[PDB]
Every structure is written in C-alpha cells, then in structure tokens.
Amino acid sequence: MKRKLLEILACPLCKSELEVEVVEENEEEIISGKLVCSSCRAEFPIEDGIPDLRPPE
Amino acid sequence: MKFLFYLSADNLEIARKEVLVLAERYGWVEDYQFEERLLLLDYAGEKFFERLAYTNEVTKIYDICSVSELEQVFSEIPVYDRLCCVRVKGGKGKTALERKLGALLWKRGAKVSVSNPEIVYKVYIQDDKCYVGLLEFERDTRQFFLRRPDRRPFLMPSAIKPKLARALVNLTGVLEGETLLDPMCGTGSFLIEAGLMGINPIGIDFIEKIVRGCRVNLEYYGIEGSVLLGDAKNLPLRDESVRGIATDYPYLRSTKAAGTLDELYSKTSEEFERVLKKGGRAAIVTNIDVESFFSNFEIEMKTEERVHGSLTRRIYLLRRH
Ligand SMILES: Nc1ncnc2c1ncn2[C@@H]1O[C@H](C[C@@H](N)CC[C@H](N)C(=O)O)[C@@H](O)[C@H]1O
Numbered sequence: 347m348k349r350k351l352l353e354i355l356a357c358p359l360c361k362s363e364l365e366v367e368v369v370e371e372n373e374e375e376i377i378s379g380k381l382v383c384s385s386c387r388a389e390f391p392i393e394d395g396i397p398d399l400r401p402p403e
Numbered sequence: 404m405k406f407l408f409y410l411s412a413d414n415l416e417i418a419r420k421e422v423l424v425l426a427e428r429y430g431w432v433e434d435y436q437f438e439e440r441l442l443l444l445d446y447a448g449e450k451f452f453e454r455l456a457y458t459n460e461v462t463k464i465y466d467i468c469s470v471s472e473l474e475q476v477f478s479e480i481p482v483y484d485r486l487c488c489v490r491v492k493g494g495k496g497k498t499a500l501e502r503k504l505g506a507l508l509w510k511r512g513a514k515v516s517v518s519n520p521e522i523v524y525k526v527y528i529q530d531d532k533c534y535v536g537l538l539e540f541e542r543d544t545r546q547f548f549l550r551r552p553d554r555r556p557f558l559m560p561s562a563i564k565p566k567l568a569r570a571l572v573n574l575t576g577v578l579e580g581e582t583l584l585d586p587m588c589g590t591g592s593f594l595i596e597a598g599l600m601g602i603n604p605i606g607i608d609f610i611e612k613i614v615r616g617c618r619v620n621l622e623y624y625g626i627e628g629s630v631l632l633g634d635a636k637n638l639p640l641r642d643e644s645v646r647g648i649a650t651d652y653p654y655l656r657s658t659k660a661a662g663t664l665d666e667l668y669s670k671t672s673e674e675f676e677r678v679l680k681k682g683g684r685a686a687i688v689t690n691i692d693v694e695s696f697f698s699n700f701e702i703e704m705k706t707e708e709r710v711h712g713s714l715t716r717r718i719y720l721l722r723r724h
Pocket residue numbers: 561586587588589590607608609610613633634635636651652653654655667
C-alpha cells in the first residue's frame with residue numbers, strides 16, 4: 347500500500363482521516379500495519395501491502 | 404482547424420461522445436458535425452488521438468468538394484519532398500482513383516511511393532461529398548487484441564474488452580496524472596487502460612483473492628496503480644478526491660432476482676456523487692435501467708449493446724452537477 351494513497355484515503359464508515367501504524371515497510375510502500383480512524387477509531391488491517399477497508403458487516 | 408474522425412461501426416454514440424469529451428478536455432471546439440461513420444470537428448489545442456479506442460483514423464482536412472472538383476483540389480493541395488501516397492475510402496474504382504490522383508501530385512513534383520510513404524493523402528467519399536486531407540493518425544488494431552482479457556495472468560470470465568474499457572475511461576475525460584477509480588475492478592480491465600494512458604488508477608474489490616489477482620495483472624502490464632479491499636457501497640475515500648469513475652456493475656442473472664441490486668445502485672450513486680470532483684464523470688455498465696438511482700446526476704449519454712441475446716448492456720455517462 348503506497349504512502350501517497352493516505353492523501354485521498356478516508357474511513358469507509360464516517361469518511362474521516364486515517365492514521366497508519368506501520369509494522370513492516372519498504373522504500374515505495376507499506377507492507378504490514380493498521381489503519382485507525384481519527385473519529386470512529388475503527389481499525390483496518392494491512393497484510394501483504396493490502397488494506398482491508400471493507401465495512402465490519 | 405478541421406479534422407475528420409473515421410469512426411468504428413461498433414457504437415457510433417460512444418465513438419462520437421469519446422472524441423467530443425477528449426476534445427473539450429484537451430482544447431476548444433468551434434463546431435462539429437456527424438455523417439454516419441464521419442465526425443467533423445473544427446478544433447484548436449492539444450492532440451489526443453493516440454488515446455482513442457472507437458476512432459480508426461484521424462485526418463487533417465484541406466478541402467471538402469464534389470467528385471468533379473477532385474482533380475482541381477489535387478492541383479492546389481500542398482506538395483512535400485517526403486514520400487507520399489493517396490488512399491481513397493468510399494465508392495468504387497478506388498485503386499484507379501488513387502493512381503489518377505497520385506499522377507496529379509507527381510505533375511507538381513511529388514514523390515509517390517505505395518510501399519514506404521511518410522505522408523498519406525486521404526480522400527473520403529460519401530454521397531458525392533469528398534473530404535480531402537492528410538492522415539494525422541491511424542489506430543493500431545493489433546494493440547487491443549494483444550491485451551485480450553484471456554491473455555492476462557489472472558483470468559475471470561465476462562471481463563470488459565480493452566476497446567470498450569478504454570472508451571469508457573476516455574468518456575470520463577480524465578487526463579494524465581489525474582485519478583480514475585474503478586470501485587468493482589475485478590481483473591482490472593479499466594485500471595489497465597487508464598494506467599496505459601498515464602492516468603493514476605485506483606481499483607476497489609470486496610473479494611481478497613480478486614484484489615490479489617488484479618494487482619498481479621497491473622504488474623504484468625507494468626502499471627503503477629493502487630488496488631484496495633473495500634466495498635463500492637462505502638468508499639474508503641475523501642470527498643471530491645477522484646476525477647473519473649469507470650466501472651462494470653454486477654449483472655442480474657435472473658428476472659427472479661429483481662430488486663437485489665437496488666441497495667448497490669442507491670449506495671454507489673450517493674458514494675460516486677460524494678467522491679467525484681465538481682463536474683466529474685462516471686462511465687458505468689449495467690444490464691438493467693438505473694435512471695431512477697442516478698437522478699442526482701446529469702445523464703450525458705445512454706446507449707445499449709446486446710451481447711448474447713439474453714444479455715443487453717446499458718452504458719451510461721453520468722456527470723456530477
Ligand atoms: N459491492 C462491491 N464492492 C466491491 N467490489 C464488488 C462489489 N460487488 C461486486 N464486486 C466485484 O466486482 C467484480 C465483478 C463486477 N465488475 C461485474 C462483472 C460482470 N458485469 C458480472 O455481472 O459479474 C468482482 O470481482 C466482484 O468481487
């Protein structure tokens with residue numbers, strides 16, 4: 347998951363700004379980590395450079 | 404400046420709108436006229452012809468005349484020192500006419516070569532009207548065939564073909580460095596076409612195996628884009644963050660499942676309007692009439708394409724207003 351993507355990425359629920367909690371990174375993308383909302387405080391995982399931003403339905 | 408666009412017969416509505424959308428984004432249109440597979444544009448600005456999917460040829464027009472005035476225009480039209488040839492489209496005795504017109508050019512010092520010409524003189528004959536000019540662009544038909552969906556490393560049936568996928572990205576009017584979103588991206592047909600034209604592609608899909616395979620398809624074509632796991636009903640994106648949306652919706656397989664896509668159409672309609680920039684466009688493919696879900700949008704184009712006899716595709720161009 348590219349870092350420049352955080353500039354247009356928002357929470358799928360409340361559409362608020364997301365924060366990245368990097369576990370594993372690369373020169374061009376984020377490999378492992380979490381995505382946390384600044385309003386909902388909803389969590390979204392990043393595995394093999396893929397963020398799972400699907401609603402918790 | 405006058406340009407003739409010789410359009411593909413596939414869908415003239417898409418073919419015409421594709422030219423007009425890119426022309427309004429790249430430059431300024433004084434006027435235009437349609438005549439079957441011919442589109443005449445009085446245009447100034449940047450050339451966008453290499454992007455076109457439903458245009459076969461682009462010619463810069465020198466003159467418009469009748470068949471009897473043809474020899475006189477070939478006595479006036481500028482001559483060059485590079486190798487040239489004449490190519491006639493329309494009517495009968497085409498090869499004889501090309502040889503005759505080539506001889507008129509030679510009379511004024513032209514170097515005619517059929518094998519290796521650098522310059523191509525174009526004559527389009529339609530209902531005793533001759534459009535004379537110089538070939539500006541000719542689309543390489545082999546390029547879409549070489550990108551056939553069955554040739555990608557991650558294959559899924561019912562993928563949108565490269566030609567239609569490129570036309571739809573173009574209909575959004577998205578430019579190089581701008582963002583095109585496909586929120587139900589599948590194997591990445593729309594993402595591939597956008598990336599090949601220099602647009603920044605963003606794909607979304609709700610099945611993990613599919614987003615992984617899509618990412619491999621982008622790698623395969625050498626495209627720089629982002630593929631995320633998400634739902635098109637709840638876009639994980641900021642307001643006014645994307646310039647264009649191009650997507651193929653799930654199709655109804657049975658009339659017994661009528662109303663099951665109502666929520667998907669309602670949620671995406673609101674989500675697309677939120678996420679699109681002002682005056683932004685969504686080019687969408689459905690197999691049902693969705694006018695009622697997109698009343699919040701201006702419908703710039705609606706066309707139909709019967710594919711199987713069981714399947715009739717509806718193609719819309721929606722504009723945020
Ligand atoms: N709500 C949704 N959000 C994200 N991806 C979706 C959603 N619904 C379907 N998809 C994906 O969309 C892809 C298929 C669609 N583009 C439609 C293809 C074709 N018209 C059909 O009827 O199957 C698949 O890869 C699905 O996983």
